[PDB]
Amino acid sequence: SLPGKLADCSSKSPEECEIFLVEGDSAGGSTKSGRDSRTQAILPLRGKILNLDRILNNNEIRQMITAFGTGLAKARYHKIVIMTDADVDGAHIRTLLLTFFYRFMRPLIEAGYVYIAQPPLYKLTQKQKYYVYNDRELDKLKSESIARYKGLGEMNADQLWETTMNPEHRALLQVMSVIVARALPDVRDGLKPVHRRILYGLNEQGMTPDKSYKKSARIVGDVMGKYHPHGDSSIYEAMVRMAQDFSYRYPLVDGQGNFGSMDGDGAAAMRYTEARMTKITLELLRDINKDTIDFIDNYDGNEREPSVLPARFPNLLANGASGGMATNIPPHNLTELINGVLSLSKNPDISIAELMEDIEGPDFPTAGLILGKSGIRRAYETGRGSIQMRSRAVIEERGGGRQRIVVTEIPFQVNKARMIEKIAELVRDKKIDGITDLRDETSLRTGVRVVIDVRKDANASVILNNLYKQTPLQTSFGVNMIALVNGRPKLINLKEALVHYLEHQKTVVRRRTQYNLRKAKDRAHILEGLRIALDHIDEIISTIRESDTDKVAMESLQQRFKLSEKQAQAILDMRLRRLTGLERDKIEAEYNELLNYISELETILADEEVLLQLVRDELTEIRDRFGDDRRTEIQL
């Protein structure tokens, strides 16, 4: 009987009593409310405390035991219900607890004293809503919107009680797609859920590069409330990351203010730093509203969001993807990439070895050196391979025979401070002799500059080679090209990544042509009715002003001038100001051009290669405006 932590029941006979183990925040309070305190006692576990990571019993678990009473047939509660959420987090505790019981308290499992809660699963809102517990029941329910309960904290006390812990109605049980899709980038646009939502929220609020910087909170707050309902931290961090010259080969966010550093310096408060779209990002959301990608419902059903972006440049390979680290893809050269894609499109059957005549290999924003084509080959042929990144370092001779190491560029994602802080240790731990001083003079003007002062007697060259060994001054990049292909996580090699990409581009362009074509017809149709309308205006006003209701108006108009439902409507929504003299010709001018446009669009659609070239050209154009010089040197 823990006083402050556990809620006790009146009954004292273990046969009657039942104890619910719920996650404190998940449903501690509401679970304490809906219960039948005459026979129901609750013990909320402090989720954070519980965290294969075995160790001495937790204060939380120790309490769990005390309350049971066995830790022996002297048990206090015959039934021990485990209430936990459906979510990733929830299954954690459910398993940890179960797993636990087996190891130090199996008799309970043997005795059938531990149960597992079964809350509703679905609520069908069609105010009438439904309480389904499994797909089959749901399938039968719907045949005879949906919203799946994935958190106990979504439910009120009484409902929690009525559906899940009230014996009369309850249905106890004796005794990872979120994790997946939520991390891995789509192979089509390179973005992972948070990033895509972010770039989308930038687009939706029209924070284009041509307009002024908006405060960061203004974007975090929007995305969090509409697409990504989690801590601001996760969104702001991910947004900061896209804005760092040393993190993205092609920053997608344009930040203003303090945005951290290679040393893991933090970024300023979100209400201080400003951010807007990068010009290259516009090529990432280009045509998004021309039915080029399928939209989906947002987490709660009140908004709509892109399953992918048009991604008019090969972003996955370009900017890379980063890691648990289920995947690990490196940045590449946009010019090389686009050139590689153009080479793919000229002939489908091109070899990875030939793709590599365009795509030299990785190309980190941080520059530096790659130590050989070996790991690159393996990584491109299979999707896995270690790649050797070594800093750009030179030694320079000065005064009284003294020497000096100057580190100009460091390996990607290496924390410069921790590296400096490390060499220092190797010197205090006397594992390095010759270093008389080390400074990190890295600034905006000098660029990265770590300076190691070697002494006269020492050998800088030798020391240097010893850093490649004892420090991050050389780091391996473990390629591991995993990405969402066809909704499923897949491992890809170089060619395959581009293939799915180019495919996406052919889909985007065609889908755009179609949208544009059916939007033009729609408008051409509407213009015909307007022309008719305007021409015989006298008539139109006659038949309308004779009509008693807007509905019969619709009727006469279609009847007498042979207008369509849409057309009649448009004429009724015409403003008197459209009656001026110039209008008629603008309507005819817009029409005559629109007809020509419709024609050109049907021409693209009709011919396969015409469309592919359209893709070829648009790609070529972007490469021309955004492509730049390679920074990382592959040597040997």
> Would you say 144 is a known binding-site residue?
no
Residue in 137, 433, 440, 590 binding its own copies, rule: CB under 8 A: 440
Which residues ranging from 217 to 246 are in contact with Ca ion (CB under 5 A)? 231
- The enclosing H or E element of 477 equals strand 474-480
87 is in an annotated binding site: yes
Do the Cβ atoms of 523 and 594 come closer than 8 Å?
yes
Number of residues that bind Ca ion (CB under 5 A): 1
CA distance to 68, 155, 395, per residue, from 167 (Å): 21, 18, 78
Of 486, 481, 485, the residue nearest 187 (C-alpha): 485
161 binds, among its own copies, Ca ion, none (CB under 5 to 8 A by kind): its own copies
Number of Cβ within 10 Å of residue 605's Cβ equals 15
489 bridge partner residues:
484
Q: Is 23 annotated as a binding residue?
A: yes
Contact call for residue 582 and its own copies (CB under 8 A): yes
If binding is defined by CB under 8 A, does position 271 make contact with its own copies? Answer: yes
Give Cβ neighbours of residue 189 (< 8 Å, ≥ 6 apart): 196, 284, 308, 309, 310, 311, 315, 316, 504
Q: Closest separation between CB of residue 574 and its own copies, Å?
A: 5
Strands across the sheet with 253-256, in order? 214-215, 274-277, 253-256
Measure the CA–CA gap between 541 and 470, rounded to whole angstroms: 89
* Dist CA 230 CA 506 (whole Å): 35
Closest CA to 290 of 504, 519, 505: 519
The full length of the chain comes to 636
DSSP-derived letter for residue 607 is: -
Does residue number 266 form part of the binding site for Ca ion (CB under 5 A)? no
> Which residues from 344-373 bind Ca ion, rule CB under 5 A?
none
Residue 296 token pair: 């989906």
Contact partner at residue 553 from its own copies, Ca ion, none, CB < 5 to 8 Å by partner kind: its own copies
Contact by Cβ (8 Å): 264, 418: yes
Site membership for its own copies, residue 36 (CB under 8 A): yes
- Using CB under 8 A as the binding rule, whether residue 438 contacts its own copies is answered as yes
Which residue of 144, 176, 549, 625 would you call a contact of its own copies, by CB under 8 A?
549
Residue 156 within binding range of its own copies, rule CB under 8 A:
yes
What tokens were used for 113? 């004293």
Question: Is 272 a residue of the active site?
Answer: yes
Catalytic residue among 248, 272, 515, 597: 272
Q: With contacts defined by CB under 8 A, name the span among 188-196, 329-337, 388-396, 419-427 that binds its own copies.
A: 419-427
Q: Which is nearer to Ca ion, 236 or 477 (CB)?
A: 236
190: left (phi over 0), alpha (psi -120 to 50) or beta: left
If the CB atoms of residues 590 and 633 are measured against its own copies, the closer one turns out to be 590
Q: How far is the CB of 564 from its own copies (least distance, A)?
A: 16
Q: From its own copies, Ca ion, none, which one binds at residue 469 (CB under 5 to 8 Å depending on kind)?
A: none
Residue 123 engages its own copies in binding (rule: CB under 8 A): no
Give the number of C-alpha atoms closer than 13 A to the C-alpha of residue 293, restricted to the C-beta side: 24
Does position 35 interact with its own copies (CB under 8 A)? The reply is yes
Q: How far is the CB of 335 from Ca ion (least distance, A)?
A: 40
- Find the binder of its own copies among 279, 398, 418, 586 (CB under 8 A): 418
Minimum distance from CB of 273 to its own copies (Å)?
A: 6
Which is closer to its own copies, CB of 534 or CB of 612?
534
What residues line the site for Ca ion (CB under 5 A)? 231
Binding residues: 23, 85, 87
By annotation, the residues acting in catalysis are: 272
Binding residues for Mg(2+): 23, 85, 87
